[PDB]
């Protein structure tokens, strides 16, 4: 494709690594840096105007980061593996006051990724679809962004027919994680603004920036 599926894989492969909420925010900020690096290895993203590049990532970061840690956590049981190396587990999350949402990540993202055994090429493509969000407000050219998303849609549907021909509803199973991810992402931002506002959690510079 003009979204070559190997370039999306390479980009995911290019960036492999007391209070759970402090630990999660620290991993988020750490990884926010390498998210920028990931974005620049997706085909055509750097070719966009800088203002749009900023917008897409300011819109996508939270959903982009959650998908990435979620897929990383496939192998852990009733928990999450932060990019820092630390596990967070259901119990720790519930007992630090953020259990409802943590459970949603597990059941709707982490365990669903496990049950369908989605690969890095698939995750990368879902993550790229998220990055190229034509609905993001303030975009200088939404059409060229919808076009890039349509290309990833084509490349992924191609990949899924080649690699998993025995399951013809896989393309759609992949894309139906994205509304869940949007709902989970919005709930996480809503948590994060409230954390910032009351000041119960230290929040590093790059996350602070994204939150303004």
């Amino acid at each position: 494709e003009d979204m070559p599926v190997e370039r999306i894989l390479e980009a995911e492969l290019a960036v492999e690594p007391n209070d759970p909420v402090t630990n999660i925010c620290q991993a988020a900020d750490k990884q926010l840096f390498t998210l920028v690096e990931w974005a620049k290895r997706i085909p055509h993203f750097s070719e966009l105007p800088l203002d749009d590049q900023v917008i897409l990532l300011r819109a996508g970061w939270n959903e982009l980061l959650i998908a990435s840690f979620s897929h990383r956590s496939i192998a852990v049981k009733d928990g999450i593996l932060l990019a820092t190396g630390l596990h967070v587990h259901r119990n720790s999350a519930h007992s630090a006051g953020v259990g409802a949402i943590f459970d949603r990540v597990l059941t709707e993202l982490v365990s669903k990724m496990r049950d369908m055994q989605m690969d890095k090429t698939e995750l990368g493509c879902l993550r790229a679809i998220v990055l190229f969000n034509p609905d993001s407000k303030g975009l200088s050219n939404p059409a060229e962004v919808e076009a890039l998303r349509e290309k990833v849609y084509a490349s992924l549907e191609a990949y899924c027919k080649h690699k998993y021909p025995e399951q013809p509803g896989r393309f759609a199973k992949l894309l139906l994680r994205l509304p869940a991810l949007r709902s989970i992402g919005l709930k996480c931002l809503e948590h994060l603004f409230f954390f910032k506002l009351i000041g119960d959690t230290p929040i590093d510079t790059f996350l602070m920036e994204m939150l303004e």
């Binding site: 920028v36 620049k40 750097s46 800088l50 590049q53 900023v54 990532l57 300011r58 920036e209």
Partner: peptide, 11 residues
């Protein structure tokens, strides 16, 4: 949004 702009530059 300084940090992000600074990181997105590479050419």
């Amino acid at each position: 949004h300084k940090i992000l702009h600074r990181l997105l530059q590479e050419g």
